[PDB]
């Protein structure tokens, strides 16, 4: 049958109260299976269902290293959005990213996702074609031009079409 | 395995 995998990453800035809170949650079909929260004592990716215990410590280690990077991506890009939208560095703001893959009954890709939201509004999304982008406003248009010149679409497409699908089946087999 | 590091906004 059809299946899906989705990751949701959000970061909320804490004006003069420390660094942004970074959370990431994975979903297989529509159920949470993995989670990372920067606010933890020892922040690392954690199995949210018992069948994810099957993955060895290398898996968790490697996956945790990605989160650390993402956290850094979020702090910087939060500050650049303050720039585009001409806001003060004293207010709370939120940047969200969601990506993943839907597979068809034949196991192959049905739809890939890679999209971003700022303060609860759409920012930029990869279209279903996995070649073009939809920009919600003036500011996201800046990102669209940059991304069109730098081959961003082909970069995300590589992950969405291959690894994302392969790990989905990997998790399904564990389940 | 997760998506690689995203591009600059």
């Amino acid at each position, epitope marked *: 049958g059809p299946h899906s995998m989705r990751y949701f990453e959000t970061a909320v800035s804490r004006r003069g109260l420390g660094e942004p809170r970074y959370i990431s949650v994975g979903y297989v079909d529509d159920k949470e299976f993995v989670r990372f929260d920067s606010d933890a004592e020892n922040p690392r990716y954690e199995p949210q269902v018992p069948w994810m215990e099957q993955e060895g410590p290398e898996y968790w280690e490697r996956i945790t290293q990605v989160a650390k990077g993402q956290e850094q991506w979020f702090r910087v890009n939060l500050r650049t959005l303050l720039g585009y939208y001409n806001q003060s560095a004293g207010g709370t703001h939120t940047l969200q990213r969601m990506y993943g893959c839907d597979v068809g009954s034949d196991g192959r890709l049905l739809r890939g996702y890679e999209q971003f939201a700022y303060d609860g509004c759409d920012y930029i999304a990869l279209n279903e074609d996995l070649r073009t982008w939809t920009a919600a406003d003036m500011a996201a248009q800046i990102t669209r031009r940059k991304w069109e010149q730098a*081959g961003a679409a082909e970069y995300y497409r590589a992950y969405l079409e291959g690894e994302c699908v392969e790990w989905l089946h990997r998790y399904l087999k564990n389940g | 395995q997760l998506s690689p590091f995203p591009f600059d906004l």
Partner: T-cell receptor, first 111, second 111 residues
Framework: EAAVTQSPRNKVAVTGEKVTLSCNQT?????MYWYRQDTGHELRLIYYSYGAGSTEKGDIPDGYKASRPSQENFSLTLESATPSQTSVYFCASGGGGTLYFGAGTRLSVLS | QSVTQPDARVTVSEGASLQLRCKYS??????LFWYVQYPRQGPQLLLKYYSGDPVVQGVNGFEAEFSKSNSSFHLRKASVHRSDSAVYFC??????????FGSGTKVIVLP
């Protein structure tokens, strides 16, 4: 691509000296990198930055320190220059995917 | 090692065809690049592969072919010139956070 510039281009340092290598990029790139190349062959990563305030230990960070005070400047400090730190040093920037290198900083150490 | 260049040096006659072999063991999604380093210079981007057409074109009449089945990103120039003499580096992205370079192939063009 020619928007990354390093300073100095050529140095002869003395052992124990504090040596600061400077990098400026006007590519509006968030990611900056310091590699070193000894053999005219492999480039090994020392330190990198995800943006202002970010500093990340590479594969061989020992004896080095880095500073990213702003988006355009990324400096590499040798606290106390040692002969083993003799190398060609390359700064790079990236906005995702590909990286763009500076022309290089030839560093010699005199004992 | 994430990328392997099996030949340290290669010699070809002017106007002949060049193949530079590259192999990767990177298990995740391979983002691949070829860089050219001219004497006393920083490495310059030739071409890259993210996805799509496995045959990609670079600057200076360079092309490379991605092959998943052979885990290779071999480089080609149909007709080499005197000035192609330089060192060539294969590179693979480390989870999108920076590049990991091969050992590099030195190309000698016999006039």
């Amino acid at each position: 691509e020619a928007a990354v510039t390093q300073s100095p281009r050529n140095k002869v340092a003395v052992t124990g000296e504090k040596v600061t290598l400077s990098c400026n990029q006007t590519n509006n790139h968030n990611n900056m990198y310091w590699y070193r190349q000894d053999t005219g062959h492999e480039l090994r990563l020392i330190y990198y930055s995800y943006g202002a305030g970010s500093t990340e230990k590479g594969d061989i960070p020992d004896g080095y320190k880095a500073s990213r005070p702003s988006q355009e400047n990324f400096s590499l400090t040798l606290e106390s220059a040692t002969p083993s730190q003799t190398s060609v040093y390359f700064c790079a920037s990236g906005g995702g995917g590909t990286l763009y290198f500076g022309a290089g900083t030839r560093l010699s150490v005199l004992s | 090692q994430s990328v392997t260049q099996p030949d340290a040096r290669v010699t070809v006659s002017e106007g002949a065809s060049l193949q530079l072999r590259c192999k990767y063991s990177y298990s995740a999604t391979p983002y691949l690049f070829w860089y050219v380093q001219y004497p006393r210079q920083g490495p310059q981007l030739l071409l890259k592969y993210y996805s799509g057409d496995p045959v990609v074109q670079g600057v200076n009449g360079f092309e490379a072919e991605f092959s998943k089945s052979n885990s290779s990103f071999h480089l080609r120039k149909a007709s080499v010139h005197r000035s192609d003499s330089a060192v060539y580096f294969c590179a693979v992205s480390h989870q999108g956070r920076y590049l990991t370079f091969g050992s590099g192939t030195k190309v000698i063009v016999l006039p």
